[PDB]
Amino acid sequence: YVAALFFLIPLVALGFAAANFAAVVRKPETERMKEISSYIRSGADSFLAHETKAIFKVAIVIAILLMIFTTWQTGVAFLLGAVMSASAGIVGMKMATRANVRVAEAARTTKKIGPALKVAYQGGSVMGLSVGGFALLGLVLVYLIFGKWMGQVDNLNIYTNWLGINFVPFAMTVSGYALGCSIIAMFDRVGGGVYTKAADMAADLVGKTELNLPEDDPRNPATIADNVGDNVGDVAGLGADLLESFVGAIVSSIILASYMFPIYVQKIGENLVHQVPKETIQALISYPIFFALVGLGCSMLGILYVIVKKPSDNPQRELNISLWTSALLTVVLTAFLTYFYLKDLQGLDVLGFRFGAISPWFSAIIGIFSGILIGFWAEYYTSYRYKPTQFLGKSSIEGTGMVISNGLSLGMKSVFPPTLTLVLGILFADYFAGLYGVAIAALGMLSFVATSVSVDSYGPIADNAGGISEMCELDPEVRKITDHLDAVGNTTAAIGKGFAIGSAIFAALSLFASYMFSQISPSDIGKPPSLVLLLNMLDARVIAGALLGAAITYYFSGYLISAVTKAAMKMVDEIRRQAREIPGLLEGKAKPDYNRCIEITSDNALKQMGYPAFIAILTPLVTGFLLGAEFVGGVLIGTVLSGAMLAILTANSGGAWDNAKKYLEAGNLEGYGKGSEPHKALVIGDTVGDPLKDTVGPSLDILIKIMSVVSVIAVSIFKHVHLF
Amino acid sequence: YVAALFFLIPLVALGFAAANFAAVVRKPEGTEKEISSYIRSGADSFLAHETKAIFKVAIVIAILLMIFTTWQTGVAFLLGAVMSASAGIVGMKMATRANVRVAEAARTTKKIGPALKVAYQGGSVMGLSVGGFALLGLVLVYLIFGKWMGQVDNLNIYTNWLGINFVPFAMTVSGYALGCSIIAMFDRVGGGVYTKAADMAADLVGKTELNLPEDDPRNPATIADNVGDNVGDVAGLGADLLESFVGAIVSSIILASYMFPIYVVHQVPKETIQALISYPIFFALVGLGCSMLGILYVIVKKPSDNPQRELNISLWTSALLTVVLTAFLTYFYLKDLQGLDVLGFRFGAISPWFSAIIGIFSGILIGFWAEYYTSYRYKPTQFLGKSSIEGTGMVISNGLSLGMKSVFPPTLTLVLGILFADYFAGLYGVAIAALGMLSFVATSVSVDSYGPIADNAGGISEMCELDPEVRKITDHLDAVGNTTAAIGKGFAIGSAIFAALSLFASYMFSQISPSDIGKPPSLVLLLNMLDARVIAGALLGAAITYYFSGYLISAVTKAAMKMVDEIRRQAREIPGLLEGKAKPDYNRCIEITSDNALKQMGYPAFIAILTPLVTGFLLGAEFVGGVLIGTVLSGAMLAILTANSGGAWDNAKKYLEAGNLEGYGKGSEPHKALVIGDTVGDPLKDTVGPSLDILIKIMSVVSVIAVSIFKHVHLF
Ligand SMILES: O=P(O)(O)C(O)(Cn1ccnc1)P(=O)(O)O
Ligand SMILES: O=P(O)(O)C(O)(Cn1ccnc1)P(=O)(O)O
Ligand SMILES: [Mg+2]
Ligand SMILES: [Mg+2]
Ligand SMILES: [Mg+2]
Ligand SMILES: [Mg+2]
Ligand SMILES: [Mg+2]
Ligand SMILES: [Mg+2]
Ligand SMILES: [Mg+2]
Ligand SMILES: [Mg+2]
């Protein structure tokens, strides 16, 4: 049976990632290189172990609560998704820590971009296969065990658990899975981002501007902290976040299809004429899973060809060819799959398939194209090759104040072009296949999460390799090879963040729909969807909730930035004290103390990482129990809008600042060099952008999805338990 | 009849402002007055050019309105535009004339009292001008078109040629508010761009690069800084706040006018609708009278203990008097009406008074939060300042974090206020509270303008070698003033949010046609946010607000970069300027800033005007409503954040300058980082922040005016 092969696909992805990891094992690693690799891996492993222990304790608590109030299988799937996210993060962290020194040694010996690009892509591919395989494995496991083995997909009827809980079985199970994935991603990424960005700000600022020392200089006591933070915050958090986004895209369609069946009914003399055939509903539920499986398989084939493919001097050319080929093949195979799976079905027109069975494929096509433009728009704004980043670089001569003001404008201006792309994508998907197609586009925009995760992971390995080169005092040319891979990596990371936020926006609209559906009760089960899908924004409660949600998102970003700044200030103080008190460090005859900086950042991150996830979880609950369901819908809408805007702005502005600093550093500016005051302004801009790109930017989509899932899960009790 | 007295009230405000201007126009002269004349000439030239451009564009817009809509709409448009322009220019002239007088008084007396009196008199002239002009234009329109012409008597939805369904007096007041808003937007954009660009360039080049004192005469941009303060923070302030006051009034006026035809067999007696339409005008008149009484008591009384103390005492007394008189007015005027429950008056005739009180208290809480977040007397600004020791990047990051965090308390206050206001009086309450939050705009205008005058005094003190105590007193007053500016911006954004909700209501009402006149109001008040078009429009509106802020910042930064380059070149090439024995070329800096401002002032207003038309003609009315919601949210957030963060940076820089940090003084590297933070916040404080509420209201007004045509005339 081919269903067995498609379900085994994710295990094949995991096996291929393991094979690539083995291929990267036994590669040539110097004794100092091996020592630095062991140090970085030990630091990252310790931090990740502490973070994972805390996160899984909290996850056990959350799972017990979910099992109590909601279906026990809901908590079981929550644990499944949480373990999936944690495993993806740990795998990525280990792969990066192992491959940084391998890529550095390759770049040092061959002196050619080919081998280093090959090794770094092997690491990124291992991580991407881990992400995709874990996501799809957990999702298909939930599907089979709870819907197929337990038959939760067969019932598809609204139940009432004790305490007055109105739920759908498979809906609750998949929602719990997505919620676990999102919680684990939130905790991991928050911790890693705080750590890495604080270390980066302190180290880069103190070394570049105050000590006049090179970047990632071994003399700098914060270099190890910066490298380990890159390994943890931008490598493990990256995988967690992207796996969570993939699972959310799939799960939005899953819940929408599940709710579609029992809701589309007609009351007739108190006889409830069911309006949609169950077979069609099951086909629509399985469609997104099979589509994600096809995307994962196509990404696997593309990555295999790339690893076997001819190496190119420019890594960007190979990355672009790989993603283009994988996307085209996925689109074609998905067209065929969508036609065959939904061919000659019944009820599609009723659920919004105006064109027909192929209408979800048209919506998925809209998602892929919309994402491509969002990435392109990000590239123009964040790349020095394009005009805007160059103007920011030219702004260096005028001063730090001009650089900061110019960067802020580029980010605020940057939001409009992608947002128009998203607005057009949403409208066309609704025209092509209603809300189900909205969710299908959310999924399609991230259909090939494996390749994007692979490239984004490929970046950090090159960064950590570059840091190893300066500390180990390797030849300047080898460092130059590492820098070339990192310059493309920064822009590709911004593109990935844009993809994530777009898929999150689509899935969040579909989750608004699912929430409005969840607001229904058995006595009100016969309402027409027109009355169910109504959220009047003239209701004072709805608009008040929208305002409160936007404000909550803004304060959340502010608190993240505050954590990063506190850590970075502590680090700057420690670096100044070490430089003043320790003799011989600036001359190179003394070895500073990095453990103090590592401890400062680790403690601050582990202490401050918990509160934001708790906020994101409890805000919907408290707001709903206080002001009802309409206020919660308004809060969700405001959060979605504010999060999209702020994520786009922060990612683009941080990338622009960093790329302008690299532009000046590369020597493309006329007359001004590393020690110039304009370079100090670029360093200040890059430090300001460090938290914005990898701390505030990525967390916003996770917050949106987690909040929407919490609301859809808990709306049943808070409609009648509203205090006011 | 007392109606005559209430209509004369605005003339009383104008007469009292003129009397104050004449009394303080004594303008005591000092050592060469020449520099004051120079600054006044520059400011007047810039304002004249700006006004010429704005009035050309206004004539074009008025012709278009008269053609497509009722000519009375364009006439009221011109009336409101002229009112706002007169307020702005009057305030700018008064400040430019009284800055040197107050500075000389403060120098001679060596005491804060006399300078406080003169500066508060200037602010009072400005605030009385704003309030009196608003109420004069409003009562004139009311009387001429609704009372004498009987537009209040008709109260029926009409359909003029081309298929526009409108209400007469509603359209007239909409045109009035739209004209005021266009003029305010243009004036504030120009003045803010000019002033903030000059300030950024001067501070960076002098303090960080040249190591020169603030407002040093050797610096060729100091004159530019003072004149820009006069243009952006003296005229723009009045334009923007007068526009906010007029918008608060007109929102309630329009909602009430649409209700009588929409509610249907008429559910609400016409007398009740006319009474509710006339109520907000009399309420604003009473508020203006109370503000005048408070300003009179303050100006006649002896000097206050603290400059903040006098402003707060005046505001408290005015608010209490307004509350009492408004209670009496609301009871007497609406006591014997009927059908007040149908429109939303849960408690009865006193519901609008409760909603206005809720709005006033929400504004007071917003001010409390602003004072908490933007004053160095409290914890957050102190932490931001201490962040300077950790570098400039740390200062910037902490400032951004503080700004983003400050948005929460005010937003929660606004949520509670919206909820409570709806409970007492419905959406009419949301609008009456929008007005109540700004019931005493005169005193707020006075206090807000008082800051810039003290700033100009400090700049002039540095320009002409003067005793240190003079500039110390002026800087003290200016330190108090910046927080007052932030509190005023908070008041403005809150009133804008309330009026924007009421405008959503009026917009949904306007979407009705004569053939669809019988629909139940419950079905009319629906704007489904699950409609893909509505949410897409919300996203696009948020993006439009963000790109608008980005364009403002880009214009300001380009102008400031050109200015910084010119100042650096002047300092490097001219010998003896840094040695203190020379004098540079200020005219070049002034010309650069003025040219850039005049070139960049047009695009943002055109965006704010055309966004609704294009979005509606492209996607329909639901998309336009979504764009309105997205714009409202994004603008509220961005305005609050920018204002609060800029105020925090500036107050932390003053904290370090005052010597409150241990061991680190003026000219220190941490002080350089603090100056960089304040300069980065400069455009955010007075250019991007205030423009957002004007953008929201202008966009909502344009949409409400043209919703009828695009509701069914949509290309897609
Ligand atoms: O991870 P980050 O963005 O901090 C950094 O990697 C940015 N970067 C450097 C070159 N390309 C991007 P670095 O710490 O090397 O300054
Ligand atoms: O233009 P602003 O109001 O920010 C300013 O007046 C701020 N300030 C100065 C003293 N007290 C407040 P200056 O540019 O003179 O630094
Ligand atoms: Mg860096
Ligand atoms: Mg790095
Ligand atoms: Mg580094
Ligand atoms: Mg960086
Ligand atoms: Mg300043
Ligand atoms: Mg000034
Ligand atoms: Mg000044
Ligand atoms: Mg300033």
Author numbering:
A (entry chain A): 2 to 30, 32 to 726
B (entry chain B): 2 to 33, 36 to 267, 275 to 726
Could you share sentences copied from the article?
Membrane-bound pyrophosphatases (mPPases) facilitate the transport of protons and/or sodium ions across membranes while catalysing the breakdown of pyrophosphate (PPi), a by-product generated in various cellular synthetic reactions – into inorganic phosphate (Pi). Similarly, VrPPase has been solved in multiple states, including IDP-bound (VrPPase:IDP), single phosphate-bound (VrPPase:Pi), two phosphates bound (VrPPase:2Pi), and different mutations at the hydrophobic gate. These structures show that mPPases are homodimeric enzymes, with each monomer consisting of 16 and, as found in sequence databases, occasionally 17 transmembrane helices (TMHs), organised into two concentric rings: the inner ring (TMH5–6, 11–12, and 15–16) and the outer ring (TMH1–4, 7–10, and 13–14). Here, we solved two TmPPase structures in complex with ETD and zoledronate (ZLD) and monitored their conformational ensemble using DEER spectroscopy in solution.
In contrast to the TmPPase:ETD structure, the TmPPase:ZLD structure adopts a partially closed conformation. The overall structure is more similar to the IDP-bound structure (RMSD/Cα of 0.760 Å) than the resting-state structure (RMSD/Cα of 2.32 Å). However, compared to the IDP-bound structure, the TmPPase:ZLD structure exhibits noticeable movements in three of six inner ring helices (TMH11, 12, and 15) and seven of ten outer ring helices (TMH1–4 and 7–9). These movements extend outwards from the hydrolytic centre, leaving it only partially closed. A cross-sectional view confirms this observation, showing the tunnel extending from the hydrolytic centre to the enzyme surface, unlike in the IDP-bound structure, where it is closed. Although the hydrolytic centre of TmPPase:ZLD is more open, the coordination of the Mg4ZLD complex with the active site residues closely resembles that of Mg5IDP in the IDP-bound structure. ZLD is nonetheless positioned about 1.0 Å above IDP because the steric bulk prevents it from sitting deeper into the hydrolytic centre. However, unlike the IDP-bound structure, and even though the arrangement of TMHs in the ion gate is almost identical, we did not observe any density for a Na+ in the TmPPase:ZLD structure despite its higher resolution (i.e. 3.26 Å compared to 3.5 Å for the IDP-bound structure).
